[PDB]
């Protein structure tokens, strides 16, 4: 597979996830992987139909991110995500509200879209 086609499919998966989040209503590759790991950890705490589906989609998207990273001759292992009681942080000045979480995730994906168009670092 060409790396061009990997980039195309990553952008397409991002657009799919963004439109799915619509229907319900960072910079380098490492920071993107970390953001998606954190969002996976969040989504696992509020499991519904669409939330489980979005978390699985994010797993695939992270796999594609790592395909790109390895095509750029640079390693960035599976980001752990959080340091870890979820409920407290999530309820207060955080996420928890399923809509708020999905909106923050939509914004992060939309930023990743532009950043991937810019051939970002690793």
């Amino acid at each position: 597979v060409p790396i061009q086609k990997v980039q195309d499919d990553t952008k397409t998966l991002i657009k799919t996830i963004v439109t799915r989040i619509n229907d319900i209503s960072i910079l380098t590759l490492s920071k993107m992987d970390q953001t998606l790991a954190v969002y996976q950890q969040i989504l696992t705490s509020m499991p519904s139909r669409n939330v489980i589906q979005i978390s699985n989609d994010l797993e695939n998207l992270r796999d594609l991110l790592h395909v790109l990273a390895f095509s750029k001759s640079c390693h960035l292992p599976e980001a752990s995500g959080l340091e870890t009681s979820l409920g407290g942080v999530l309820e207060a000045s955080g996420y928890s509200t399923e809509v708020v979480a999905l909106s923050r995730l939509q914004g992060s994906l939309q930023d990743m879209l532009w950043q991937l168009d810019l051939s970002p670092g690793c």
Partner: antibody, heavy 121, light 109 residues
């Protein structure tokens, strides 16, 4: 690249079996290794997978609780252990390396020869 | 019961075009995720024919297409060597797993 598997095995109900999948010239840890079974006259059944460098495995809901997928990056060998063997498990078990590095998004391009495991009293 | 559905058998005479289908729901073939096609000859391990709906690793006689919640594999100019089992694979997002189809035994008459 080639994936070489252990030899066939005959086991009895209740016992367990462990099938191996060694590499023959590849960055075994960077890729993904899937385990797929096929009973006689039935089709392929995705049992699970694992990316060795990351260490975390994924299992089909059907085989969850009875299958364990592990990987040894040193020997570049994956292992699939099935416990509490039943008559229905009689089948050929394949291991398959994905086409691109760490993802099944683009298929599995390097399959193994298959290991026949027969469960009968 | 496999998530992906295929015809149990299709048959054609040499030189004929054959089409094998692979239908599912919006959680697998629909919603972006692709459909791979694997060929398994009598007494052999599966081989990757098609990945990502259409791409080939494979003679140009094999081809793939995807529409809605269906995908299809076309074998033009059927040969004696194409007689084999054909499995479609796709990612189910409700079950979280790259699950295969029931498979289609392609016979050359």
């Amino acid at each position: 690249v080639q994936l070489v598997q252990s030899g066939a095995e005959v086991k009895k109900p209740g016992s367990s079996v462990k099938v191996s999948c060694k590499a023959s010239g590849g960055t075994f840890s960077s890729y993904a290794i899937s385990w797929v079974r096929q009973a006689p006259g039935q089709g392929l059944e995705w049992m699970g997978g694992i990316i060795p460098i990351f260490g975390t495995a994924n299992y089909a809901q059907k085989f969850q609780g009875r299958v364990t997928i592990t990987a040894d990056e040193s020997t570049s060998t994956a292992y699939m252990e099935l416990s509490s063997l039943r008559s229905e498990d009689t089948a050929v078990y394949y291991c398959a390396r994905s086409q691109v590095p760490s993802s099944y998004y683009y298929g599995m391009d390097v399959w193994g020869q298959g290991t026949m495991v027969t469960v009968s009293s | 019961q496999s998530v992906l559905t295929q015809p149990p058998s299709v048959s054609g005479a040499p030189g004929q075009r054959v089409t094998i289908s692979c239908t599912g729901g919006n959680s697998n073939i629909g919603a972006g995720y692709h459909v791979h096609w694997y060929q398994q000859l009598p007494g052999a391990a599966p081989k990757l024919l098609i990945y990502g709906d259409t791409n080939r690793p494979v003679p140009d006689r094999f081809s793939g297409s995807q529409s809605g919640t269906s995908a299809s594999l076309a074998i033009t100019g059927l040969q004696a060597d194409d007689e084999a089992d054909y499995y479609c694979q796709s990612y189910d997002r409700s079950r979280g797993g790259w699950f295969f189809g029931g498979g289609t035994q392609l016979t050359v008459l």
